[PDB]
Design a protein around this ligand. Structure first.
Ligand code: UAQ
Ligand code: UAQ
Lengths: 193, 193
């Protein structure tokens, strides 16, 4: 039951490593999961819907991991606090590069994917803003930009930069340099005048 | 000759304000330019090729405007130097929102568009880096990150942030706030420790 579903999900993720959604048939998804095409259609209405669920689970994994971090303060300086946070996204999406890459393209096409991404981005920006605001209240950050606007630009940087880097786009920050790069820009822009 | 070509370009830009490339036929492009479908095919192999040229001219306009700025130093502080520069991109792409939005989608699909964007981004990052390096040499900026990596992340921020803002995406920086937002993050990240 759940097992066939899990196998369709895993077959899909596997197949997205080597080629795009376009050049993957539900036929390929069925065989890989060891089921018929009709049986596939019982678990998912489409191949697009397989991607969506896959993306859903990556996004929830990131979020949950961020919630875990937020609940257990790490005994460290401001720079490592931010780093530890950004690293959740770096590791989680970096561990699911094929889904990441396919998700982001599907944003153009699928309203569900666009809305899924949109919902979580807003949540992560709201959280970034609350932390900046909290840093301003304790007197550790200067009151420069509207915290929420700053959080927005910083989150959008991370999205574009993390993903160009995982795709190996030209141009991009080398994947082994991208954490330090993003952390420097977060902390200088959050704490600097 | 050039006039029919110009009219196809303008018809296309006009039509992209109200709907995507997908829901624009070459038929619509021909009528709008006041020509036949066959005559259209003499000037352009496809509707995709119309977008590409349109994007080409926006991108060259931005570049040329940046070259003009680079050739005439403005008598001003570091913050306004960066602002004046980022503003070239804000105004130029912000004046061609339909082409911008369609260009960026076509990146997924068209290898020409992807390469066009890629070429110019590299050029703009190289230039940003040369300016950061020049600021480090005169002793106005600290030697923090690899200048080229910093330039890369900052350029990618601007691309994602400018465009989310012009599209009116959720989330985004309001278009009337996005200049100040980006300038703060450039200058704090370039000059800060
Ligand atoms: C405190 C956290 C909040 C979120 N964040 C971050 O990179 N979000 C942007 C993103 C999502 C997927 C790729 O990039 C790190 C800092
Ligand atoms: C000195 C310049 C260099 C380029 N730049 C910039 O925003 N480039 C990124 C971009 C292109 C299109 C949208 O965003 C402003 C600063």
């Amino acid at each position: 039951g759940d097992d066939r579903e899990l196998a369709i999900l895993a077959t899909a993720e596997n197949l997205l490593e080597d080629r795009p959604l376009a050049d993957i048939s539900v036929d390929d998804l069925a065989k890989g999961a060891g089921i018929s095409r009709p049986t596939f259609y019982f678990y998912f209405p489409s191949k697009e819907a397989v991607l969506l669920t896959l993306l859903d689970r990556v996004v929830n994994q990131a979020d949950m991991a961020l919630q875990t971090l937020a609940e257990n303060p790490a005994d460290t300086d401001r720079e490592n606090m931010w780093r530890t946070g950004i690293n959740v996204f770096f590791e989680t999406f970096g561990s699911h590069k094929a889904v990441t890459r396919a998700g982001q393209a599907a944003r153009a096409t699928s309203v569900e994917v666009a809305e899924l991404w949109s919902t979580f981005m807003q949540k992560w920006i709201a959280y970034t803003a609350a932390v900046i605001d909290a840093e301003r209240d304790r007197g550790a950050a200067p009151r420069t930009l509207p915290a929420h606007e700053l959080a927005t630009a910083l989150n959008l940087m991370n999205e574009r930069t993390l993903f160009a880097s995982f795709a190996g786009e030209q141009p991009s920050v080398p994947e082994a340099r991208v954490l330090d790069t993003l952390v420097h820009i977060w902390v200088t822009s959050i704490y600097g005048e």
